[PDB]
């Protein structure tokens, strides 16, 4: 069937929408280049449209319905529980889009008469009819990206459908305890949101190492969303009916599931028809979960019908990476043609076509790669990078606009162990917060796609925590990587990792003669700065699983 189907109404705006980053005396402290940068708006939805619309015509076999099995054997074991209309409110993101019926997250939040009982009003609605179509809005996604003139041209607004904010709490009594417990116990070692970063870089390399012959690959599967079926949504659905459940939450997961997450009819934010989707839906709590056990289904599947020995996957959503053993280059490649072909059966085709690689350092799976670098003793430590144009592109819009989104954040806090993040965003954001006297402003940031508030403050033992205390005596780093970053410096009009050494020890300095935290910042962050390295002693739920697009808050 057709991914979608479009009346004609235009997928529009519900507020203004910036594209350009503004001069700023801050912003371009940092990026000089600012034409470079761009945001996504609405008036590109037309593009992405025609992308992501296409028919699907999946073909399933024995080694698709072999491993289905085998995970449905493992969701038997799992127990889940449904969740009261305190804990789902709980649950929601104080600047959540908010109904259509009278009230807001903050109404939700505050578990206000009105906004409990219309929760309570839907969910037994969904209780009673479990056929009707539940209205989703569909809309633009505004994402800051730089130009890369190689591609031809910039990229196109992704398109993000939700249902109302009453539904929304209605899915997490339902399946938050689904969504967040059950992946782990189907595909094991191979989810990959149960891994902090250190846990995740030591996983790949520890699966690298365990091969004779190592060979590793990525798949790109081509619009991911738009190519699951309403069959694999169906599939996804008896997988969590295979959980010991409560009889309403079995009741009310055949409502969603049939209502909502097979498709259903799609409006704008004026209100007009915008056409009807037959695929998943980019904001829903069951995208992430639903995702990864489709794409690592398919994908186990596949790995038999190519034969590839002795493989490891590691699955994030769409995000797929393989690791096996080696048959020869010529036999690699013919592999992975038919490896390919499964997925293409199974209504998965790929973007660009999976390459073989035999160096860990040159894939790249969930945008990331791994990488090499030493403690203060030389010893060897491996970590996860990428190619910092993107962050720091949103880090400059992100500096000159305020901008609910902190990507920064999350990039220093996913990242640090990098020396673009340690050099370069951890410098220009001290200096900002120090000079704004925000030191002790919290900051909303994305984790996995949950919403969390951090404080920059506590970023040493975050740091510690999810890395290790080697992210804070990282040197000698790889010649590939340092070349990365100096080429993407000089693309952007970054100030060269020699200005940014300036910066850091002013700053260092700075937060050294502040109190508390603010010295142990200064002290463990910017110990690269300077020659005379003080003593870095260890300082005296963020991955269990993935909620992209789930509206979730923690
Ligand atoms: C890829 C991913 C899991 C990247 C990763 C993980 C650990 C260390 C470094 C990179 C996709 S899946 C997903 S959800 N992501 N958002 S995130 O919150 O995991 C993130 C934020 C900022 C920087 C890296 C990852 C991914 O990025």
Known sequence: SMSYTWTGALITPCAAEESKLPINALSNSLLRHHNMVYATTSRSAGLRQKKVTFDRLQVLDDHYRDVLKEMKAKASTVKAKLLSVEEACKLTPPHSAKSKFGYGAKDVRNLSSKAVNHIHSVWKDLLEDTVTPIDTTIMAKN????????????????????????????????????????????????????????????????????????????????????????????????????????????????????????????????????????????????????????????????????????????????????????????????????????????????????????????????????????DASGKRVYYLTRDPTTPLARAAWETARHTPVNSWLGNIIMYAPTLWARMILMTHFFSILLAQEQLEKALDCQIYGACYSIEPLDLPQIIERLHGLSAFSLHSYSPGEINRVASCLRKLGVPPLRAWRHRARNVRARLLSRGGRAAICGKYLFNWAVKTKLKLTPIASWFTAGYSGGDIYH
């Open 143 to 374: 994402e800051v990206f730089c130009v890369q003139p190689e591609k031809g041209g910039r990229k196109p607004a992704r398109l993000i459908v939700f249902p109302d904010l009453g539904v929304r709490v209605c899915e997490k009594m339902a399946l938050y305890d689904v969504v967040s417990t059950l992946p782990q116990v189907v595909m094991g070692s191979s989810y990959g949101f149960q891994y902090s970063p250190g846990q995740r870089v030591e996983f790949l390399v520890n699966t690298w190492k365990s091969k004779k012959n190592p060979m590793g690959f990525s798949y790109d599967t081509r619009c991911f969303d738009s190519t699951v079926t309403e069959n694999d949504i169906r599939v996804e659905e008896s997988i969590y009916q295979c959980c010991d459940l409560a009889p309403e939450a079995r009741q009310a997961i055949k409502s969603l599931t049939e209502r909502l997450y097979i498709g259903g009819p799609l409006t704008n934010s004026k209100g007009q028809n915008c056409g009807y989707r037959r695929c998943r839906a980019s904001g829903v709590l069951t995208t992430s979960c639903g995702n990864t056990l489709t794409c690592y289904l398919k994908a186990s599947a596949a790995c038999r019908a190519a034969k590839l020995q002795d493989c490891t996957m590691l699955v994030n959503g769409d995000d797929l990476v393989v690791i096996c053993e080696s048959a020869g280059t010529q036999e690699d490649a013919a592999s992975l043609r038919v490896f390919t072909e499964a997925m293409t059966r199974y209504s998965a085709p790929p973007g660009d076509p999976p390459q073989p690689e035999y160096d860990l350092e040159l894939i790249t799976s969930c945008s990331s790669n791994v990488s090499v670098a030493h």
